[PDB]
């Protein structure tokens, strides 16, 4: 999930805005 | 900014700040 994707590795815009509306 | 490790509040700030008015989703469990 975003946990394992931002936090415990590092983050990207990309990723980031699968979570966005 | 967004290239870094963000956990808890801070990983929350940055989706609000990049969604914007979309807003977004957290689901920290799944």
């Known amino acids: 999930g975003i946990?394992?994707?931002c936090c415990t590795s590092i983050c990207?815009?990309?990723?980031?805005?699968?979570?966005?509306? | 900014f967004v290239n870094q490790?963000?956990?808890g509040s801070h990983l929350v700030?940055?989706?609000y700040?990049?969604?914007?008015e979309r807003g977004f989703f957290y689901?920290?469990?799944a």
């Open chain 1, 12 to 21: 990207s815009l990309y990723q980031l805005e699968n979570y966005c509306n």
């Open chain 2, 27 to 29: 689901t920290p469990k």
């Open chain 2, 17 to 20: 700040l990049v969604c914007g």
């Open chain 1, 3 to 5: 946990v394992e994707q």
């Open chain 2, 13 to 15: 700030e940055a989706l």
């Open chain 2, 5 to 7: 490790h963000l956990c």
